[PDB]
Amino acid sequence: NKFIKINDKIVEIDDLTPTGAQILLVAGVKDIVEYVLFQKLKNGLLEEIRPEEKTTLDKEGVETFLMFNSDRTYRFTLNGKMFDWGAPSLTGATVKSLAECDFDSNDVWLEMKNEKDKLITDHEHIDLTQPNVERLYTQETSINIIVNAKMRVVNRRVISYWDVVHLAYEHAENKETSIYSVDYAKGPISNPEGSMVDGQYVQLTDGMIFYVTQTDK
């Protein structure tokens, strides 16, 4: 009753010392040569498993693999550690998962030699086809914003309308007889100035300014 996980699918296997080729076959791949297989080790590193190479699986537990349909791999580093990757890009969210950091309270950053390090938001893609080895790191989010003239430190990069309102009025979401407006400026390039209504979100940056009003409905 043995399973492994491949790209987050559970996959049943009946060999505890399968080769890479045997794993690609169980995974439903037609042409195994066209795939690159990695085992995701307990320390968080990815080890490539060539078709002729064996891995050893415990009788209990679920080893984890990544399988890419790719004729090449790209390298990057993540908090100093070297990774190979079977796709030309990956998202900030996938980098967080590889880093094993607190997902919501960190950002992903790409080292840049000639400009400031680049913030990679969760859904943005890091282009590994750029010519050097991309150097990525996670860092705890701590963002200083002004809400109704008061300094607020926020540990999340993207927050909601009601999140903003609550930075100005502690007990405001339940106030069915109140209408709250939200304006902002000095935001980042993805939202520099504007207004927010319920259902919207905003990406924060240091020094961003918010003005929140409460009126009777």
Residues lying near a second copy in the complex (CB under 8 A): 33-34, 36, 50-51, 71-75, 77, 82, 84, 128, 131-135
Compute the least distance from the CB of residue 58 to a second copy, in Å.
24
According to DSSP, the residues that pair with 201 across neighbouring strands are: 160
One-letter amino acid identity for 130? Q
Measured distance CA(64)–CA(130) in Å, rounded:
29
Residue 84's binding partner among Ca ion, a second copy, none (Cβ under 5 to 8 angstroms by kind) is a second copy
Nearest to 4 by CA among 29, 21, 34, 26: 26
Compute the least distance from the CB of residue 123 to a second copy, in Å.
24
CB neighbour list of residue 174: distance below 8 Å, 6 or more residues apart: none
Binding mask 121-140 for Ca ion (x = CB under 5 A): -------x-x----------
Applying CB under 5 A, the span of 23-31, 71-79, 102-110, 135-143 interacting with Ca ion comes to: 71-79
Q: Is residue 71 close enough to count as binding Ca ion by CB under 5 A?
A: yes
Residue 82's binding partner among a second copy, Ca ion, none (Cβ under 5 to 8 angstroms by kind) is a second copy
CB nearer to a second copy: give 79 or 178.
79
Residue 15's binding partner among a second copy, Ca ion, none (Cβ under 5 to 8 angstroms by kind) is none
- Do the Cβ atoms of 203 and 121 come closer than 8 Å? yes
CB nearer to a second copy: give 75 or 150.
75
Compute the least distance from the CB of residue 213 to Ca ion, in Å.
48
Q: Is residue 196 close enough to count as binding Ca ion by CB under 5 A?
A: no
| Long-range contacts (CB closer than 8 Å, 24 or more residues apart) made by 158-165 | 158/121, 158/122, 158/201, 158/202, 158/203, 158/204, 159/201, 159/202, 159/204, 160/200, 160/201, 160/202, 161/196, 161/197, 161/198, 161/199, 161/200, 161/201, 162/198, 164/196, 164/202, 164/210, 164/212, 165/212
CB nearer to Ca ion: give 32 or 146.
32
Binding site for Ca ion (CB under 5 A): 71, 128, 130
